[PDB]
PDB file of C-alpha atoms in Angstrom:
ATOM      1  CA  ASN A   1      86.816  25.789 185.421  1.00 59.97           C
ATOM      2  CA  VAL A   2      88.778  26.032 188.670  1.00 60.69           C
ATOM      3  CA  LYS A   3      87.034  22.817 189.728  1.00 61.37           C
ATOM      4  CA  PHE A   4      89.322  20.716 187.524  1.00 63.63           C
ATOM      5  CA  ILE A   5      92.528  22.292 188.859  1.00 64.24           C
ATOM      6  CA  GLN A   6      91.189  22.950 192.344  1.00 61.75           C
ATOM      7  CA  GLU A   7      90.442  19.276 192.823  1.00 62.18           C
ATOM      8  CA  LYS A   8      93.855  18.366 191.419  1.00 59.26           C
ATOM      9  CA  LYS A   9      96.135  20.309 193.786  1.00 58.82           C
ATOM     10  CA  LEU A  10      93.783  20.159 196.780  1.00 59.25           C
ATOM     11  CA  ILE A  11      92.739  16.512 196.666  1.00 57.10           C
ATOM     12  CA  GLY A  12      96.286  15.463 195.849  1.00 58.39           C
ATOM     13  CA  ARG A  13      97.695  17.548 198.687  1.00 55.85           C
ATOM     14  CA  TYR A  14      95.350  15.673 200.977  1.00 56.46           C
ATOM     15  CA  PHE A  15      96.224  12.097 200.082  1.00 55.77           C
ATOM     16  CA  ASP A  16      99.901  12.993 199.495  1.00 52.17           C
ATOM     17  CA  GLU A  17     100.688  14.639 202.825  1.00 51.26           C
ATOM     18  CA  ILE A  18      98.867  11.817 204.572  1.00 50.00           C
ATOM     19  CA  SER A  19     101.286   9.567 202.718  1.00 50.58           C
ATOM     20  CA  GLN A  20     103.884  11.071 205.066  1.00 51.43           C
ATOM     21  CA  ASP A  21     102.021   9.899 208.192  1.00 49.78           C
ATOM     22  CA  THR A  22     101.568  13.552 209.129  1.00 47.43           C
ATOM     23  CA  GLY A  23      98.028  12.981 210.404  1.00 48.88           C
ATOM     24  CA  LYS A  24      97.267  16.500 209.179  1.00 46.18           C
ATOM     25  CA  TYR A  25      94.180  15.282 207.319  1.00 47.84           C
ATOM     26  CA  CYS A  26      90.865  13.467 207.801  1.00 47.09           C
ATOM     27  CA  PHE A  27      88.094  11.943 205.655  1.00 47.43           C
ATOM     28  CA  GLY A  28      84.337  11.617 205.956  1.00 46.53           C
ATOM     29  CA  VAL A  29      81.632  13.838 207.378  1.00 43.64           C
ATOM     30  CA  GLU A  30      82.039  13.232 211.103  1.00 43.24           C
ATOM     31  CA  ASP A  31      85.824  13.587 210.949  1.00 44.99           C
ATOM     32  CA  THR A  32      85.881  16.431 208.415  1.00 45.56           C
ATOM     33  CA  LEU A  33      83.249  18.141 210.579  1.00 46.59           C
ATOM     34  CA  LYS A  34      84.911  17.459 213.929  1.00 48.11           C
ATOM     35  CA  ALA A  35      88.250  18.738 212.671  1.00 46.94           C
ATOM     36  CA  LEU A  36      86.488  21.868 211.426  1.00 48.21           C
ATOM     37  CA  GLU A  37      85.126  22.207 214.940  1.00 47.39           C
ATOM     38  CA  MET A  38      88.669  21.575 216.167  1.00 44.21           C
ATOM     39  CA  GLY A  39      89.902  24.517 214.123  1.00 44.74           C
ATOM     40  CA  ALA A  40      92.668  22.151 213.045  1.00 42.72           C
ATOM     41  CA  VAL A  41      91.460  22.155 209.450  1.00 42.03           C
ATOM     42  CA  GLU A  42      93.398  24.407 207.111  1.00 42.42           C
ATOM     43  CA  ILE A  43      91.448  23.442 203.993  1.00 41.61           C
ATOM     44  CA  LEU A  44      88.184  21.531 203.501  1.00 41.64           C
ATOM     45  CA  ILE A  45      87.685  19.007 200.681  1.00 45.45           C
ATOM     46  CA  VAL A  46      84.010  18.481 199.797  1.00 44.65           C
ATOM     47  CA  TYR A  47      82.639  17.445 196.374  1.00 47.44           C
ATOM     48  CA  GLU A  48      79.839  19.166 194.475  1.00 45.47           C
ATOM     49  CA  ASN A  49      78.240  15.766 193.928  1.00 45.34           C
ATOM     50  CA  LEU A  50      77.955  14.955 197.624  1.00 42.35           C
ATOM     51  CA  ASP A  51      75.234  12.425 198.449  1.00 41.66           C
ATOM     52  CA  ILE A  52      75.720  12.972 202.187  1.00 41.20           C
ATOM     53  CA  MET A  53      73.189  15.128 204.012  1.00 39.97           C
ATOM     54  CA  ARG A  54      72.597  16.267 207.594  1.00 41.09           C
ATOM     55  CA  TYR A  55      69.368  15.257 209.308  1.00 36.73           C
ATOM     56  CA  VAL A  56      68.462  15.904 212.934  1.00 38.30           C
ATOM     57  CA  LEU A  57      66.685  13.136 214.842  1.00 35.72           C
ATOM     58  CA  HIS A  58      65.128  14.024 218.221  1.00 34.25           C
ATOM     59  CA  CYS A  59      62.555  12.616 220.640  1.00 34.69           C
ATOM     60  CA  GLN A  60      60.136  14.517 222.897  1.00 38.27           C
ATOM     61  CA  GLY A  61      61.820  12.814 225.838  1.00 39.22           C
ATOM     62  CA  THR A  62      64.881  14.919 224.997  1.00 41.99           C
ATOM     63  CA  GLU A  63      66.905  12.082 226.538  1.00 41.69           C
ATOM     64  CA  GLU A  64      68.557  10.934 223.301  1.00 40.34           C
ATOM     65  CA  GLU A  65      69.277  13.417 220.512  1.00 41.88           C
ATOM     66  CA  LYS A  66      70.805  12.067 217.305  1.00 41.63           C
ATOM     67  CA  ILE A  67      72.204  13.913 214.286  1.00 40.10           C
ATOM     68  CA  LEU A  68      74.186  12.002 211.651  1.00 38.17           C
ATOM     69  CA  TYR A  69      74.764  11.478 207.934  1.00 38.31           C
ATOM     70  CA  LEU A  70      72.711   9.067 205.839  1.00 35.54           C
ATOM     71  CA  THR A  71      73.152   7.819 202.279  1.00 36.47           C
ATOM     72  CA  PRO A  72      70.288   6.890 199.873  1.00 35.02           C
ATOM     73  CA  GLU A  73      70.168   3.430 201.468  1.00 36.30           C
ATOM     74  CA  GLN A  74      70.664   4.640 205.055  1.00 34.06           C
ATOM     75  CA  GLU A  75      67.669   7.006 205.142  1.00 32.69           C
ATOM     76  CA  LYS A  76      65.646   4.211 203.550  1.00 30.19           C
ATOM     77  CA  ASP A  77      66.512   1.705 206.281  1.00 31.20           C
ATOM     78  CA  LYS A  78      65.482   4.121 209.046  1.00 32.68           C
ATOM     79  CA  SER A  79      66.711   1.532 211.575  1.00 29.15           C
ATOM     80  CA  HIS A  80      69.573   3.829 212.578  1.00 29.91           C
ATOM     81  CA  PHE A  81      67.059   6.557 213.467  1.00 28.03           C
ATOM     82  CA  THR A  82      65.964   4.306 216.348  1.00 27.74           C
ATOM     83  CA  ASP A  83      68.062   2.711 219.101  1.00 25.99           C
ATOM     84  CA  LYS A  84      67.913  -0.442 221.221  1.00 27.01           C
ATOM     85  CA  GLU A  85      68.791   1.745 224.223  1.00 30.36           C
ATOM     86  CA  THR A  86      65.643   3.823 223.846  1.00 25.90           C
ATOM     87  CA  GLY A  87      63.360   1.699 221.704  1.00 23.78           C
ATOM     88  CA  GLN A  88      61.683   4.902 220.568  1.00 26.36           C
ATOM     89  CA  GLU A  89      61.271   6.358 217.087  1.00 27.73           C
ATOM     90  CA  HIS A  90      63.158   9.621 216.643  1.00 28.41           C
ATOM     91  CA  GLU A  91      61.486  12.639 215.052  1.00 27.99           C
ATOM     92  CA  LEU A  92      63.300  14.483 212.296  1.00 26.97           C
ATOM     93  CA  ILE A  93      63.192  18.219 212.965  1.00 24.97           C
ATOM     94  CA  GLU A  94      64.944  19.404 209.824  1.00 25.33           C
ATOM     95  CA  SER A  95      67.034  18.288 206.864  1.00 24.52           C
ATOM     96  CA  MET A  96      69.963  20.264 205.488  1.00 26.02           C
ATOM     97  CA  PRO A  97      72.125  19.530 202.415  1.00 24.93           C
ATOM     98  CA  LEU A  98      75.488  18.865 204.055  1.00 22.31           C
ATOM     99  CA  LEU A  99      77.582  19.881 201.040  1.00 23.32           C
ATOM    100  CA  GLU A 100      75.434  22.983 200.724  1.00 26.52           C
ATOM    101  CA  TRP A 101      75.871  23.488 204.456  1.00 26.73           C
ATOM    102  CA  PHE A 102      79.655  23.187 204.169  1.00 24.39           C
ATOM    103  CA  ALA A 103      79.774  26.192 201.847  1.00 23.23           C
ATOM    104  CA  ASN A 104      77.226  28.034 203.983  1.00 25.00           C
ATOM    105  CA  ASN A 105      79.344  28.658 207.097  1.00 24.94           C
ATOM    106  CA  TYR A 106      82.807  27.200 206.351  1.00 20.85           C
ATOM    107  CA  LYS A 107      84.081  30.686 207.190  1.00 20.18           C
ATOM    108  CA  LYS A 108      82.907  30.271 210.779  1.00 16.47           C
ATOM    109  CA  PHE A 109      84.985  27.116 211.236  1.00 13.39           C
ATOM    110  CA  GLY A 110      87.976  28.822 209.644  1.00 14.72           C
ATOM    111  CA  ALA A 111      88.326  26.131 206.989  1.00 14.46           C
ATOM    112  CA  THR A 112      88.687  26.607 203.240  1.00 13.69           C
ATOM    113  CA  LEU A 113      85.570  25.095 201.713  1.00 12.91           C
ATOM    114  CA  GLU A 114      86.768  23.868 198.347  1.00 14.25           C
ATOM    115  CA  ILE A 115      84.552  21.918 195.975  1.00 15.51           C
ATOM    116  CA  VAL A 116      85.824  19.030 193.856  1.00 16.01           C
ATOM    117  CA  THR A 117      84.625  16.239 191.559  1.00 17.33           C
ATOM    118  CA  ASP A 118      85.439  12.608 190.774  1.00 18.61           C
ATOM    119  CA  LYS A 119      86.162  13.495 187.138  1.00 16.96           C
ATOM    120  CA  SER A 120      89.884  13.578 187.911  1.00 14.73           C
ATOM    121  CA  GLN A 121      91.880  10.554 189.075  1.00 12.03           C
ATOM    122  CA  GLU A 122      92.583  12.280 192.392  1.00 11.64           C
ATOM    123  CA  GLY A 123      88.875  12.787 192.983  1.00 13.43           C
ATOM    124  CA  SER A 124      88.245   9.046 192.921  1.00 10.03           C
ATOM    125  CA  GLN A 125      90.854   8.590 195.646  1.00 10.38           C
ATOM    126  CA  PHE A 126      88.469  10.591 197.837  1.00  6.99           C
ATOM    127  CA  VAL A 127      85.063   9.240 196.831  1.00  6.31           C
ATOM    128  CA  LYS A 128      86.250   5.651 196.380  1.00 12.90           C
ATOM    129  CA  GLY A 129      88.647   5.819 199.316  1.00 14.88           C
ATOM    130  CA  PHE A 130      86.374   7.898 201.519  1.00 16.51           C
ATOM    131  CA  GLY A 131      83.011   9.216 200.309  1.00 15.08           C
ATOM    132  CA  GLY A 132      83.305  12.824 199.143  1.00 15.58           C
ATOM    133  CA  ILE A 133      84.146  14.698 202.351  1.00 13.23           C
ATOM    134  CA  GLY A 134      87.618  15.371 203.717  1.00 18.97           C
ATOM    135  CA  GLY A 135      89.417  17.732 206.048  1.00 21.04           C
ATOM    136  CA  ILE A 136      92.988  18.998 205.911  1.00 21.65           C
ATOM    137  CA  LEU A 137      94.570  20.001 209.234  1.00 18.48           C
ATOM    138  CA  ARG A 138      97.396  22.456 209.906  1.00 17.34           C
ATOM    139  CA  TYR A 139      99.358  20.077 212.138  1.00 16.14           C
ATOM    140  CA  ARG A 140      99.140  16.771 214.003  1.00 14.82           C
ATOM    141  CA  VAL A 141      96.149  16.826 216.350  1.00 13.86           C
ATOM    142  CA  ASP A 142      94.684  14.560 219.017  1.00 13.17           C
ATOM    143  CA  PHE A 143      91.884  12.349 217.702  1.00 17.05           C
ATOM    144  CA  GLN A 144      89.220  10.579 219.762  1.00 17.98           C
ATOM    145  CA  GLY A 145      87.289   7.416 218.956  1.00 24.37           C
ATOM    146  CA  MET A 146      87.191   4.341 221.177  1.00 25.66           C
ATOM    147  CA  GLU A 147      87.134   4.511 224.974  1.00 24.33           C
ATOM    148  CA  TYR A 148      90.324   5.372 226.871  1.00 24.65           C
ATOM    149  CA  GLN A 149      91.869   7.236 223.931  1.00 24.37           C
ATOM    150  CA  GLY A 150      94.177   9.284 226.129  1.00 25.40           C
ATOM    151  CA  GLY A 151      96.572   6.467 226.904  1.00 26.30           C
ATOM    152  CA  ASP A 152      95.629   3.311 225.044  1.00 30.74           C
ATOM    153  CA  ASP A 153      96.503   5.259 221.894  1.00 34.63           C
ATOM    154  CA  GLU A 154      93.683   3.892 219.729  1.00 36.38           C
ATOM    155  CA  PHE A 155      94.713   5.935 216.691  1.00 41.23           C
ATOM    156  CA  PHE A 156      98.124   6.923 218.064  1.00 39.93           C
ATOM    157  CA  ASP A 157     101.000   4.810 216.769  1.00 36.41           C
ATOM    158  CA  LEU A 158     103.033   6.523 219.494  1.00 36.49           C
ATOM    159  CA  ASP A 159     102.012   3.633 221.765  1.00 37.05           C
ATOM    160  CA  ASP A 160     105.047   1.727 220.496  1.00 35.21           C
ATOM    161  CA  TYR A 161     107.243   4.736 221.259  1.00 34.31           C
ATOM    162  CA  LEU A 162     106.319   4.276 224.912  1.00 34.14           C
ATOM    163  CA  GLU A 163     107.799   0.771 224.927  1.00 35.91           C
ATOM    164  CA  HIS A 164     111.088   2.126 223.584  1.00 39.28           C
TER     165      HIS A 164
END
């Protein structure tokens, strides 16, 4: 099965290149997804046994749409579905198997949707270190997270370069 070897070279190439501080990789759904949207991803690392799914939460008010990943415990809590800035209960419109989704249109994003498992040692590095979703990029790209990213260098170590 290609799975065994696919997960070996792919997964390893993810955690190894990152070992070079090349920032040409990302882990998780949000990141792996965003990078796919960024077209920065060269290859996608998603496991067959992915417990992460995509659910869309919306309210009639259409003033606060929310779509994020939830694990067995997350969907159970349901607290995330609501917000203290709206105090309203969202309404799930649809539910789509993320992993299944990844292989559905990965061609559109231009990323190589490759499946892998935790059977191999490398696989654990992903699931245990991340969760079962990763994204390899072609080259260093600009990432956004906290406010004032363009300058404060939240994820950019280059901030020190500025000093000297």
